[PDB]
Amino acid sequence: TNLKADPEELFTKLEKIGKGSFGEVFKGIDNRTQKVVAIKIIDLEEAEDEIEDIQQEITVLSQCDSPYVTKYYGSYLKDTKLWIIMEYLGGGSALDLLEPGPLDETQIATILREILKGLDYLHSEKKIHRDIKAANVLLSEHGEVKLADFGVATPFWMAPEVIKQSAYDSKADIWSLGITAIELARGEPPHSELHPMKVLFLIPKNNPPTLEGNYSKPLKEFVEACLNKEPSFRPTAKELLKHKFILRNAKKTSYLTELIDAHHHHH
């Protein structure tokens, strides 16, 4: 965290583009390179109880160096406000790209494959993402797919062992990936109609969700593989990258620009 430099001289703050954990996010311009950045501004007096979680997320992102993880450029403190500078991804989130209509299985498989490449990287680095969901998967304007917003070390994407506060590992991300697969196929996670407190006991109580609808058997089996109540029965990210659903359906990420365009024309 840079304490002398004035982020308001270094960056031009433009329109709001989201609301993440602990503050609002803006499109911005790096005034020296003219590159577009994403800027989160957190007021450290209003978000005092969460400062350690913010620091922890910055530390983790600063240790990542992967095409599949959104880049962290640095942070600045001006008066009471912490500016966090991230890579800007102009395709938006995968959740956004669900708005014009359903994804086809090639789009689903391509997005899941790239998420798996990010998880393979993190898990190989002995890291856990902890908040895999379509809202936290960002696309560049070229169709590149990257992970954003790590969870701190809403219940719909949480593995049962995470809810039961059991010691969990990277297989919790594999469960969340299975929920995200359903969300990419159907538009919403399981139980999305229910009150979160009900979901909190339904996830440990119920059999795991399945993907319902006219979807290929390999996609249903991909979901089933991820959504096993027993974490040791969930495959690794490495293994899921070789799953038949991925191998038979995933294509070049550049094809996802058609998905981004469809979202542009829908608005």
Ligand SMILES: CNc1ncc2cc(-c3cc(F)c(-c4cccc(C)n4)cc3F)c(=O)n(CCCCN)c2n1
């Ligand atoms: C539309 N294109 C686009 N491109 C890039 C980003 C980056 C981020 C972003 C990610 C982060 F991990 C942190 C971060 C890092 C360390 C600590 C903390 C507390 N936060 C900050 C961020 F601003 C972001 O929010 N959006 C908004 C959508 C969020 C979806 N969930 C972006 N939107």
